[PDB]
């Protein structure tokens, strides 16, 4: 009968970066989804495999909330079948994804006038990520035809780059907070239900 802690997810003070996105398991609660879609704060509310209006009528199990911060034009890369830096090396959604991608502008929280640098994205990986795979591993990688045996070769590229968030940046470069809700459709005795 108790409420699901969406306020600890959407209204959190700090979000982790997209390379180290935060995953929260939501279970044994009643989820009131009607305060999400009718809120005018979210610019992007795109649900795959479920309509957002019917979210109150279905009982799920093992609901996952994935929270991170990406810039403005990369919100389209949080979708099944997309390519880019975020989809390949930072956060990959499966082709059979069911759930909802919610994203809203957070320039007045996540931008500082000198430049906010608390948010990182991985620039390169040897292979694309598997879906729902987290790469917090920061490893020095090479450049080509010379090994990284110290300084001596071509100098060694770093995988994680920080976003340059200033509030004077135009929209599209501005911080957008992304929460991805992921469900499973009625395979076990369900724990997460609507009213």
């Amino acid at each position, epitope marked *: 009968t108790n409420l699901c802690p969406f306020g600890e997810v959407f209204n959190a003070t700090r979000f982790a970066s997209v390379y180290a996105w935060n995953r929260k398991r939501i279970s044994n609660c009643v989820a009131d989804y009607s305060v999400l879609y009718n809120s005018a704060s979210f610019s992007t509310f795109k649900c795959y495999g479920v309509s957002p209006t019917k979210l109150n009528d279905l009982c799920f199990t093992n609901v996952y909330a994935d929270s991170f911060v990406i810039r403005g034009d990369e919100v389209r890369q949080i979708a099944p079948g997309q390519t880019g830096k975020i989809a390949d090396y930072n956060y990959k959604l499966p082709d059979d994804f069911t759930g909802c991608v919610i994203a809203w502008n957070s320039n007045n929280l996540d931008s*500082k006038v*000198g*430049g*906010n*640098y*608390n948010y*990182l994205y991985r*620039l*390169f990986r040897k292979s694309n990520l598997k879906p729902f795979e987290r790469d*917090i*591993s*920061t*490893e*020095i990688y090479q450049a080509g035809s010379t090994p*990284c045996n*110290g*300084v001596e070769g071509f*100098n*060694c*590229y*770093f*995988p*994680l*780059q*920080s976003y*340059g968030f200033q509030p004077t940046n135009g929209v599209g470069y501005q911080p957008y907070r992304v929460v991805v809700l992921s469900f499973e459709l009625l395979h076990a005795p369900a724990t997460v239900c609507g009213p």
Partner: nanobody, 119 residues
Framework: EVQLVESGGGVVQPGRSLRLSCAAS????????MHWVRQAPGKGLEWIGN???????FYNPSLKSLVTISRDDSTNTLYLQMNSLRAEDTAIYYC?????????????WGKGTLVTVSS
């Protein structure tokens, strides 16, 4: 010209602190992000920490609370505080510099400092 110089290495007791300094000369220290790297003899390079103009410090998840990266921008310097030294931290340390407006190429490197720990 562009130059990174380091200081602070030596032979010290384990558990005693160290303060390694990386002075930058010839370029403005802003708009570049600074890295600390170490390598052990017989081992490859291991990245330690990043710090930006904001003061955002990012550490290696492998080693926790042993180091503390401290940037200073009045005199274009970078400090590393190392606390509670273990025997395996015998390493050559390097100061690295990336441009924030390109790929993560580390451009020029420090020549390095030698840290030898023993009892």
């Amino acid at each position: 010209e562009v130059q990174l110089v380091e200081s602070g290495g030596g032979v010290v007791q384990p558990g005693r602190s160290l303060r390694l300094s990386c002075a930058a000369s010839g370029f403005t220290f802003s708009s570049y992000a600074m890295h600390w790297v170490r390598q052990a003899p017989g081992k490859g390079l291991e990245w330690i920490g990043n710090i930006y103009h904001d003061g955002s410090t990012f550490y290696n998840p492998s080693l926790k609370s042993l180091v503390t990266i401290s940037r200073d921008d009045s005199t274009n310097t970078l400090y590393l505080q190392m606390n509670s030294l273990r025997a395996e931290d015998t390493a050559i340390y390097y100061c690295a510099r990336v441009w924030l407006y390109g790929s993560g190429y580390m451009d020029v490197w420090g020549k390095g400092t030698l840290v030898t720990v023993s009892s």
